[model samples]
Target: MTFQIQRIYTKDISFEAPNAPHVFQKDWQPEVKLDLDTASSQLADDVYEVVLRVTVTASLGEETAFLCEVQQGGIFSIAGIEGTQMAHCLGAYCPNILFPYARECITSMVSRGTFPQLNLAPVNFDALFMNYL
Candidate 1:
């Protein structure tokens, strides 16, 4: 009858800092890299589930800092929508719902690593997911 988001949830999440204490000692500039991916599947004729996978790494060469991964997704219901609009909604809208969760999770994990107060800049979802489509 109406379009709706049925749920937003974490399917999986993980973080690692294998080279911890020592990693802090190096004069690391702390280069951070982020990898994001998305997938969608039809749950029913009018329902689809979208998933966003976020991976972040801060390291230099053989040395390392921290690595984190967050697997999150959202379930949405659709009605009377089709073609590009539906594609865009699934590609952009759904992942947008879970991205904040990803950011907060990674930030907390990084802080727990006891590194500097690392703050991630606000990401433009449209721009983030435009090629994401």
Candidate 2:
């Protein structure tokens, strides 16, 4: 494979629960919402920087419970590929590589916030890329 992942890391992360103790009083049956996006830019030569941005918010009854955002980044070295192949690699493949780390960050943050464990569902980046067309 001409594609290579050079590094994977969390570029940014934040979690906040404005309601906090008040929010905890309510039942844990909350509505969770997720906002996801991805970006890529070339660095030098065949190296590229890719980031998967994931945002999650949970609402319990009438109040907001918790909100978190994570930027999972990776440096990839891609050579001998171009056009749609390169597009697919940056848009779908790289994001897939970063999502697990993003999901883990969200889970850990939600747990530390003293809220119910949140397990985000798997995202189909290929399907998302198709829709992006």
Candidate 3:
């Protein structure tokens, strides 16, 4: 049977600009880094929860401009799948389904932290997660 998505939503989110006013005084030349991962847990006999966590950190000079983290999760119904298909679902497909929401989440939240809209790049979960053999 084909795997189906039961639900998709942002489970947790955090946006912080600790330096705030001080950081606002700096230029917009910020270095940003992406730290992301995925985890899966069994919630029931035929259901599982997959979470995609993405952390974005931007720094201007030596001070932090902003830090945003989006934990997007979804419920999936997995039945009659195993081996590579199951791995692909949990690692790549599930995370891919949740990434868009996570990106928008962190992007919009950056506005509240005294920064212009943060533009997060698209992620390639297939290549990223495929290495999890």
Candidate 4:
């Protein structure tokens, strides 16, 4: 059997500001990092749900200017899928569908936070997973 993505959901999309409008005299570039994790829970017999949590942080000059963490989850029907196939379904297919929504949420939050319109580049999850082999 093949696992399929039924839906994608998100929770706890947020941002933090240490200081407002604090401008540095010198041009500063912030460091950005992204972390991803997956967790699974049994919902019913032969049915399971997986959550993909992505955390993105931007730090400038030793201060955290912005941080966004999103839990993008999906319910999958995995009755016969096992091992690498299951991994690929969750790591590649589910995340591919969810990341765009997460990115849009982050962009909307940043745009509302007095920053110029920020757009995230499209991510290629399939390519990322292929490299894992």
lDDT of 1 by residue, 105-129 (tens): 8888888888655566666667766
lDDT of 3 at 48: 92
Say which candidate scores most in TM-score: 2
Global fold similarity of model 3 (TM-score): 0.92
Backbone collisions counted per model: 0, 0, 0, 0
User: If scored against the real structure, what TM-score would every candidate get?
Assistant: 0.85, 0.97, 0.92, 0.72
Which is the winner by TM-score between candidate 1 and candidate 3?
A: 3
lDDT of each: 0.80, 0.94, 0.87, 0.69
**TM-score of candidate 1 on Cα atoms, chains taken together:** 0.85
Best by lDDT: 2
* Candidate 3 local lDDT, 22-125, one digit each (tens): 88888676889889989999999879999999999999988888889989999999999888888888889888988898988888898777586677788888
Cα lDDT tens digits for candidate 4, 2-105: 56666667756667655546833323555777776656676876566777676777766777667777786777677687688877776777677777777777
Clashing pairs in 1: none
After aligning candidate 3 to the native by TM-score, how far in Å is the CA of 132 from where it should be?
1.9
Clash pairs for candidate 4: none
Give the Cα RMSD of candidate 1: 2.3
lDDT: the better of candidates 1 and 3: 3
Model 2 C-alpha lDDT versus the unseen true structure? 0.94
